[PDB]
Design a protein around this ligand. Structure first.
Ligand code: AKG
Ligand code: NI
Ligand code: NI
Length: 280
């Protein structure tokens, strides 16, 4: 039984240590924050991507056609799965920030609005990380889930076991990371975030020679219903902020001809717990 708060965006200042409460005190596990962006803004950014006047976002669309036709497509390289040099990731991330800033037209700016939310919920400065030579990480990527596609079950803290995380681990507290995302467009059915009470467990994972074999077993656990779940279908402009680092989660298959498009990533404390970093 994971515990999520449902508040409005005008209420964030009433929860000034929410992020500390989720990560450090562990007194609840996530929150939905309604209307972080206006619906008009979501519809505007959506039309930019549909029509192709997207500031170049289309140039960093990764269709993932080598992962099968059941996988999400993504604008921008996600850091998960990147090689530890991060060269291609840093390039896509610069393109992403410019395209994103173009599409949002400051009405409101994506980075500014997301940073304001995280600040209100922590009382701390908020920053996008920079690489060892000053390269910018991306604040977010955009996931595009067409009809019949899903995001398979996974857990966020596995990032801390990947070579892509090497540099980020020098800046981070190494406690749980949170997930955050905001729908731009929502599908007619499906496309639901499901979060399970099954937790990240590197101890169990180390008994497997191939992580794929370990995930095949996680899939059996969650499909046996042994684990409790909660499920959410935020609307356009609502933000979902949750302990995806600790808890396995997935997004259910999209149904119908309207794609699910979501913008988001992750956040976590700095080494000394005196700043919020956020990235994708
Ligand atoms: O639906 C999305 O854009 C991402 C879902 C997810 O896996 C996360 O927020 O960590
Ligand atoms: Ni995730
Ligand atoms: Ni539904």
């Amino acid at each position: 039984a994971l515990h999520f708060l449902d508040i409005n965006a005008t209420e964030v200042k009433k929860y000034p240590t929410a992020i500390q409460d989720i990560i450090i005190n562990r007194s609840f596990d996530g929150m939905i924050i309604r209307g972080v962006f206006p619906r008009d803004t979501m519809e505007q950014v959506a039309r930019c991507l549909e029509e192709g006047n997207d500031g170049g976002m289309k140039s960093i669309l990764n269709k993932n056609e080598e992962f099968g036709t059941k996988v999400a497509q993504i604008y921008g390289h996600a850091i998960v799965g990147q090689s530890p040099d991060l060269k291609d990731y840093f390039a896509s991330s610069a393109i992403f920030r410019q395209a994103c800033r173009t599409m949002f037209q400051g009405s409101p700016d994506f980075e500014e609005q997301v940073e304001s939310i995280f600040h209100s919920l922590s009382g701390l400065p908020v920053e996008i990380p920079t690489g060892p030579e000053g390269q910018t990480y991306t604040p977010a990527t955009i996931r595009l889930l067409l009809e019949g596609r899903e995001i398979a079950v996974h857990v966020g803290n596995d990032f801390l076991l990947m070579p892509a995380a090497n540099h980020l681990k020098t800046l981070l507290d190494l406690s749980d990371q949170l997930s955050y995302f905001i729908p731009l467009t929502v599908p007619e059915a499906g496309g639901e975030l499901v979060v399970y009470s099954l937790e990240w467990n590197p101890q169990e994972a180390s008994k497997y020679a191939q992580m794929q074999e370990y995930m095949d077993d996680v899939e059996f656990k969650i499909k046996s219903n042994q684990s409790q779940s909660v499920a959410y279908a935020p609307g356009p402009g609502d933000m979902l902020l949750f302990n995806g680092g600790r808890y396995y989660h997935r997004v259910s298959e999209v149904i119908g001809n309207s794609p699910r498009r979501t913008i988001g990533g992750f956040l976590a404390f700095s080494k000394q717990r005196d700043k919020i970093y956020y990235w994708s």
